[PDB]
Design an enzyme around this catalytic site. Sequence first.
Site, PDB file in Angstrom:
ATOM      1  CG  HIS A 120     -64.764   0.287  36.496  1.00 55.66           C
ATOM      2  ND1 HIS A 120     -64.473   1.563  35.477  1.00 55.66           N
ATOM      3  CD2 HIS A 120     -63.610  -0.386  36.474  1.00 55.66           C
ATOM      4  CE1 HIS A 120     -63.287   1.212  35.109  1.00 55.66           C
ATOM      5  NE2 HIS A 120     -62.746   0.198  35.516  1.00 55.66           N
ATOM      6  CD  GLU A 167     -62.921  -1.482  29.155  1.00 60.17           C
ATOM      7  OE1 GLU A 167     -62.770  -2.477  29.597  1.00 60.17           O
ATOM      8  OE2 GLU A 167     -61.929  -0.574  29.263  1.00 60.17           O
ATOM      9  CD  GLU A 305     -60.318   2.654  31.358  1.00 62.74           C
ATOM     10  OE1 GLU A 305     -59.229   2.015  31.436  1.00 62.74           O
ATOM     11  OE2 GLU A 305     -61.140   2.465  32.291  1.00 62.74           O
TER      12      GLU A 305
END
Length: 375
Positions: A120, A167, A305
Site C-alpha cells: 500500500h 496506486e 476502492e
Amino acid sequence: RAKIPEIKIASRKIPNNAALKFVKDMKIGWNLGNTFDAAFENPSFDDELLYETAWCGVKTTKQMIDTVKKAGFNTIRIPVSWHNHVTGSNFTISKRWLDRVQQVVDYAMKNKMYVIINIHHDIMPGYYYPNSQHLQTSIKYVKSIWTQVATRFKNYNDHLIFEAVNEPRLTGSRFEWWLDMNNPECRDAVEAINKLNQVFVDTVRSTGGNNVSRYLMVPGYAAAPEYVLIDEFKIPKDSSKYKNRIIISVHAYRPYNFALQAPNESGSVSEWSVNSEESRRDIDYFMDKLYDKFVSKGIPVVIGEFGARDKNGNLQSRVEFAAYYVRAARARGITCCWWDNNAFYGNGENFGLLDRKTLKWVYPEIVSAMMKYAR
C-alpha cells in the site's frame, strides 16, 4: 432514513470464462481501511503492531469480519503498508507484523470470503518508486516483500488474491496523480510500473504451491482507470499453465466532487441523484471504457476502492450513489470494494459504514443499497 432507488441499467454481454465468474463470485468487497495500511515515519512507540490501530483506533477481531460477512460482503480487501516493518538490506518483514496480518486474513478465510492483500503506502524512493533512477531498488523491494508474503500464504486457496501494489505513482513530483504522456518522465513511470508488475507476477509464481494458479491483481499508474486504458499499459505475461489469471485493479471515487472532495472546497457537492445526468456521467464514462478494453475481451476487472464521504448527513444522496455505482459496475461485470475506515464524524474523510467497536452498521441504508445490485 433514506430510500433505495430502483436502478434500470441494461445488463451487458459478459463472456463465460473462469475469470469473470470468479470476479462475479466476489459479489462485493469491503476494505479494512485505516488499519494495516497506516504508514508513517519515526513512531514514538515500541510496539509496531500499534500501526494497526493508529488510524482506526481499534484492534481487528474475528467478530468484525463475521459482521462484514453476514451483512453480504463476499470480499474483504486488507491493505498493507510494509515499509515500516522491514529491516536489513533485503527488506526482512517483521515476524510479529506478518503474523498479525495472517491472523486477520484467517478471519476472512474462516468466513469463506475472498481476500486481497497488497503493498500500500510504500510508494517512496528506497522502497517502491516507479522511475528509472529507483527501479534498481524497486525491483528488489517488490521481489523481497512478495517472496516473503507469497511464501507464507503459499497454501491458501484461490479465494486469496494478491494485488501487486496500491496506486503506484511518482510521489512528490508534479505528475503524482496526473500524467502527461508527452512528458518523458511520465512515459518512464508507466514503463516502470509495467516492469514492477511483471516482477510481481514472476515472483509470486516462483514460490510454488497455489501461487502458480492464484489470481493476481495489478494496477495502472495511480490505480486510475485512465492509465490501464492507455496503449502503453501492459498486462504481465505468465509462462504457467494457469491462463487469464491477471485482474485489472482500478480505483475511482467518482464523481470526485461528490464522493471524495472535501466539503470546505468550493466545488464540492453534497447532492447526488440518479435522476441527474450530471451525477451519473463520470461513472458511465470510465466504466464503459474499462468494459470495452477488458471485460468484453474476457479480461477481468475489479474496482478495489470506491465510496462517498459523509458530508454533514447527506445519507439519501450517498444511498442513491452507492446503488447506482454498484449496479453500473455489475451490469458491466465489475465487482467493487467500499473503502470503510471506521471514520464517521469530523473534518476528516468519513467513509465509515461499520462501527467496529460496537459492531453496529451506522448506515445500513447504504449497505442494503449496495447489496441490491451486487449479485
